[PDB]
Write a protein that binds this ligand. Sequence first.
Ligand SMILES: [Zn+2]
Ligand SMILES: [Zn+2]
Lengths: 154, 154
Amino acid sequence: RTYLYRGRILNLALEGRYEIVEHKPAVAVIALREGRMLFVRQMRPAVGLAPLEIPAGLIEPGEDPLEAARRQLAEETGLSGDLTYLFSYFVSPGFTDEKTHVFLAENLKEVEAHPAIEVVWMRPEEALERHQRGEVEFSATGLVGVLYYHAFLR
Amino acid sequence: RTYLYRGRILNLALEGRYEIVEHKPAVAVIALREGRMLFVRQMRPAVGLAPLEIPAGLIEPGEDPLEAARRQLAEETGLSGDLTYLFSYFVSPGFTDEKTHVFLAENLKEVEAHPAIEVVWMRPEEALERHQRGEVEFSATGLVGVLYYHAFLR
Ligand SMILES: [Zn+2]
Ligand SMILES: [Zn+2]
């Protein structure tokens, strides 16, 4: 386990033949209101475009997933709600340890008028159609939100 | 766009204040048979455990997503089938450009008796329950497969 780089959002290390990227864990929040899902978009230099995602972000030191979820939702959209843990997933276990904890948010209320991040309320059916037509791209969190909705929220 | 490392499965670069990890695109295959989903497990040094995933892998030079999907399915499980493109997603757009193309596989047939990789046929409902109980972890591909099944394959 040798480190070739210790950065801000990640560290690059080696374990023999394997290249490993250590990354802070993350959270994502699925929120539905009047049939529309709460998506967000922002410039992502790593991909060169703005995919459709859901409120998400890194878990800061001292925070547990639930607290981080509350914060990301408030900071990115200015909303608060009753959160319920759903499940988690490793974004790409073949090279990184980033683990994402997904929550469901209900009974949304605005806690701050002042939420870089574009808030995009959109019916999940519409998001899926636009993607199938090649009009928009998805981040893992956005796709998970869309699939979760079709599976358990209709 | 400065490079601090050019490796095998990834490159580490910088774009001002952003740390970017360039990674080859990938594919994942969702397959259902007799109510069981085709999951796979393998040691993943980056995470320290073996999460529940679905057949997946990198797209090699010269290959398009469909061809890569056929190959990963055959090499990891020894099966072949009729593949249909479903959708794609960026695993973690906040730091990497890895994009995953997901396919559905139907009418499975064994093409090789000789498929590191553990083949795990399991009902998606069971996979979800075990995860909720904290008995198993999910990779993004495994979770996407489970959610896709609950949304459109029942
Ligand atoms: Zn931070
Ligand atoms: Zn290769």
